């Protein structure tokens, strides 16, 4: 009662991972992302795969 018109708008937002987000496995091991490290700074094996 009293309402003449309604307009509804749906907004789609892409959210990328960033520090502060919460990540977890299936064994109760939860955590918060602290840094997004560059690829050249992360540990790598003998085949060069980081």
């Amino acid at each position: 009662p009293g309402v003449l018109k309604i307009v509804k708008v749906y907004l789609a937002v892409k959210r990328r991972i960033q520090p502060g987000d919460k990540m977890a496995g299936r064994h109760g091991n939860k955590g918060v992302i602290s840094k997004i490290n560059p690829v050249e700074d992360m540990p790598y094996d003998e085949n060069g795969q980081p």
Partner: protein, 99 residues
Amino acid sequence: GAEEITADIPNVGEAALSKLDESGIVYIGAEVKGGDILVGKVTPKGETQLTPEEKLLRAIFGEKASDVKDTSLRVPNSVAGTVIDVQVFTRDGVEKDKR
């Protein structure tokens, strides 16, 4: 009076009216950011007491357009996305706008 959905928004330029259509509703697929106007709405307002040092300013520069107040739907701050769907519901007996 009756609040109207329209594209005639006082104190807002054509920069913020790019994404709305004739009826005052954003287009489908419009990439919007925080503060952007989605649907334009104007509400009738009553008489407002103007302070004397604003009556003077009205006297100097004669612009005065305060018949209606801008109460429009705006994107929340720190929210950026694409308009993917718009639905309009109209009461039985109210004129259907173009959109």
